[PDB]
Symmetry: C2
Subunit: 41 residues, 2 copies
């Protein structure tokens, strides 16, 4: 059906955003973890 | 020209292998780091 050029494109953005969020998670979660050692040094 | 279907494909494998190696690095480097807390020769 559409498993062609138009399809391979969607993947490119899929992986793209997937690699962005992945870092944003460890970055955002690091804020909640700071509570223990609230950045005051 | 070349910046088309055939091009977007190459990217898919680029990111693919790039995400594999990335993990293989932190995995392989972990062996060298063990020296401190691991059997030394």
């Amino acid at each position: 059906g559409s498993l062609t050029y138009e399809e391979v494109l969607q993947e490119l953005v899929k992986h793209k955003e997937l690699l962005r969020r992945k870092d944003t998670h460890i970055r955002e979660l690091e804020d909640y973890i700071d509570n223990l050692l609230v950045r005051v040094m």
